[PDB]
Amino acid sequence: AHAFWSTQPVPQTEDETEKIVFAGPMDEPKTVADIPEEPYPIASTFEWWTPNMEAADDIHAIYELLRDNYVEDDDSMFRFNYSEEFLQWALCPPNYIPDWHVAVRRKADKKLLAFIAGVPVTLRMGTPKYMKVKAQEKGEGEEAAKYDEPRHICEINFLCVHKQLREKRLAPILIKEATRRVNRTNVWQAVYTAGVLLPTPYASGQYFHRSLNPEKLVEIRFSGIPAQYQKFQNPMAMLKRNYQLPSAPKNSGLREMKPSDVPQVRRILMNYLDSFDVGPVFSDAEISHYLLPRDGVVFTYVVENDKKVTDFFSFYRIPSTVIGNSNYNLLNAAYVHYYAATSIPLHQLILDLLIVAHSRGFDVCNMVEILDNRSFVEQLKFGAGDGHLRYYFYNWAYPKIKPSQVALVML
């Protein structure tokens, strides 16, 4: 039963999202003027805080709250350790709204106890092409297309409540207050993902992992040593051999992206993402922000031939704290970010991603089965991991789609 989510304009059952065919809002139309100008009441001991994302110490404070209290695996062996530079990058894209970053502090000592972040995204989120066609066949195209235009909405990430404060109903309050701030900005939809099942996802996809340093991975117990490896003389030598990668990329004219590549990367990205039902639209400034290489944060390479960019890939780094273990502090994971291929099969392009990642010291490469990510799983030796990433809209009815129809990558 859901005391909070039942009060919210989201689909309430799996049933509701099977019956849905057109995109559009769920709630009553409202106006900025309908929305309370004052922050949601919270207890006397606490206060609403808007971190300054240009302040190293506000960034640090958020960093600490996530380092100690953010998402762990089911066995409390690992916890994400997003870096400060990653958080400045993710929290401050072009035209970000400082007010959408919502925090609760203890008034006495200014200890950060809870956080959620919103950032702008321009999202295509109209009726999927299929439902759009089924709609003509039944005479209802204008209705199916009403919301085809890309929409400036809020993307929510980094909801975190201090472990000492869990199950005190603080997360509802953070969400109501984020919602109020976003609504005051005249934005009525949001997009979010979670590893947990909430009401009600529009898409769900498994995670996949590709071992790059399997000895470390087994050592920290991220990976097992499969049963067929027993019947073998020296387990690890077989495993390392199985996962070994070339030292240098195979595509000649792969190089790191540079500022002048922005317009071309934009165009082959937009062309590719445009084929999916749900996907972001980026300006040049968003392309530079999200894809220009940044040290220990995002890593992007283009294939250029005859002075033209014809393919590119990117990945970002999130290290995970290894929670038990005396020998290892961190596990260094690369996450497949946006890419586009026009001159070579995707599997050949993403082999270079794995090669570069391995070459720079990453232990595993991770992704969700969105985009055409299923297309290279077998050949590059990715295996399905635990659990699923679920995709959600706030205040947006949307039919249930497959993850291969989603082109929004979450940080």
Ligand SMILES: CCCCCCCCCCCCCC(=O)SCCNC(=O)CCNC(=O)[C@H](O)C(C)(C)COP(=O)(O)OP(=O)(O)OC[C@H]1O[C@@H](n2cnc3c(N)ncnc32)[C@H](O)[C@@H]1OP(=O)(O)O
């Ligand atoms: C238009 C603008 C809209 C803007 C907002 C759009 C929506 C944004 C929504 C947020 C998108 C987040 C995207 C990400 O960042 S997903 C990552 C979420 N973060 C973590 O998992 C970090 C570790 N966990 C924690 O920090 C806490 O356990 C959290 C904060 C997750 C819950 O704190 P706590 O454990 O102390 O519980 P409570 O007593 O305060 O509250 C219990 C209520 O909270 C509902 N709950 C539990 N987990 C989640 C979850 N991941 N999303 C949404 N709701 C969740 C739960 O069903 C229950 O409601 P109800 O079942 O009683 O009805």
Ligand SMILES: O=C1CS[C@@H](c2ccccn2)N1c1cccc(Cl)c1
């Ligand atoms: O990349 C890593 C490093 S260890 C593990 C993990 C799980 C939960 C929280 C942090 N890290 N992990 C992982 C596993 C499954 C999904 C995701 Cl997004 C990350």
